[PDB]
Design a protein around this ligand. Structure first.
Ligand SMILES: CCCCCCCCCCCCOc1cccc(O)c1C(=O)O
Ligand SMILES: CCCCCCCCCCCCOc1cccc(O)c1C(=O)O
Ligand SMILES: CCCCCCCCCCCCOc1cccc(O)c1C(=O)O
Lengths: 206, 222
């Protein structure tokens, strides 16, 4: 029954160091791990996959055609307002291209913070109050929920963090109120289909 | 700073029901054992240099009613002992719907212990992490409407100043007993950077050595 999985992808740098290689090498292997995890979720009927790089987006827009062919809807979540204008437009175009797709929804966090996400929704509500279009006492959990990232998708069912640390590190906060939390010491470049299925079992067991 | 590095521990206390069932005992016995484990953990935190301990009794009309009974009886029975151990007691959660006599007893218990200089003990009662954020948001929205605040002045530090426990040390460590790996709408905003520590030990069995195990895991992982 797992509909929406979120992953904190950690361990690329530490993997590279264990390999006796520089950081770039771990990023390349981390990108291979992204492709594998996205294929696996799309092929196993997961509705939404949300990926957070913990410690990029330009490396990504060479993959959009392939996502589109696979019926993946791509969304970026996070504060892209200070990205350069050309990158912002490439993000917008890639979202627009795939927006109609009905397969896996892939959310890529880019300069995302779970507190930022809440604050951006609160600011929207504050504007509405200032305009006289909303009473402070009318603000409830449903209403805030409507102004935080991914409110259109299935609730996050499972959060996986690779890399060994046992923290959310200001990834999703509002959205993980009822999610299963699964931590694995496996470093992100090594995280493969067996590791993903193991997380899915922790979920199903429970 | 204590050697373990931990200023503020929050605990999701789960496993009372399962503990009683394993014993072939009704729920009430698990609740009595769980209360003994609360007193033990409070004493442990107070003696090991923790500044703040925040406790959440996991449960999931009759649910509300059992939770009210637990709270009312605890406030009745335990506040004098807290005061005599120099503990400063605070209740966090939406207590606005409690009848005015109960809200008065909460106020008097908080007032009584407010000058205490030992452990600060926060007890969640009708608490949810989402509710906590929402109440803070409503405080800000009132400031906007009573022209004192511009929407674009609202930032994370500002919202942080309106959620429960903002004046205490940040939560460093969340422990959940009882085997589930979920926050279950306990603290959300406040746990953005916290160490999350899950143990299969059932709440009534979680003792000083388990608590020491969680702090030393914090000290070593931080
Ligand atoms: C910022 C956006 C870039 C993120 C894209 C991450 C890389 C994913 C590229 C996907 C490569 C092909 O991805 C599939 C997707 C869905 C179903 C699939 O079967 C496959 C399959 O190769 O088998
Ligand atoms: C609603 C209020 C619920 C509060 C329930 C917690 C009550 C705990 C009773 C106090 C137990 C005695 O707890 C200590 C606390 C601090 C330092 C201590 O040394 C002790 C010590 O030696 O027992
Ligand atoms: C030493 C004795 C220890 C026992 C006290 C520590 C735990 C007390 C937690 C009490 C939870 C009260 O929680 C409610 C009370 C009334 C109405 C409620 O809806 C709730 C609700 O959380 O939904």
């Amino acid at each position: 029954g797992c509909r929406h999985v979120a992953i904190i992808m950690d361990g690329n740098g530490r993997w590279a160091k264990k390999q006796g290689k520089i950081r770039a090498f771990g990023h390349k292997a981390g990108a291979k791990s992204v492709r594998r995890a996205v294929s696996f979720a799309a092929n196993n009927g997961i509705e939404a996959l949300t990926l957070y790089a913990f410690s990029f987006v330009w490396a990504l827009d060479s993959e959009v055609k392939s996502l589109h062919r696979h019926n993946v809807r791509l969304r970026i979540i996070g504060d892209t307002s200070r990205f350069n204008s050309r990158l912002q437009e490439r993000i917008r175009k890639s979202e627009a291209l795939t927006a109609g797709n009905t397969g896996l929804t892939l959310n890529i966090a880019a300069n995302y913070g779970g507190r930022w996400d809440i604050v951006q929704g609160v600011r929207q509500l504050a504007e509405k109050v200032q305009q006289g279009n909303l009473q402070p006492d009318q603000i409830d959990e449903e209403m805030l929920n409507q102004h935080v990232c991914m409110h259109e998708l299935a609730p996050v069912d499972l959060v996986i963090r690779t890399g060994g640390e046992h923290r959310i590190s200001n990834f999703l906060l509002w959205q993980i109120a009822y999610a299963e939390l699964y931590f694995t010491d496996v470093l992100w470049p090594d995280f493969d289909e067996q590791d993903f299925e193991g997380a899915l079992n922790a979920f199903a067991n429970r």
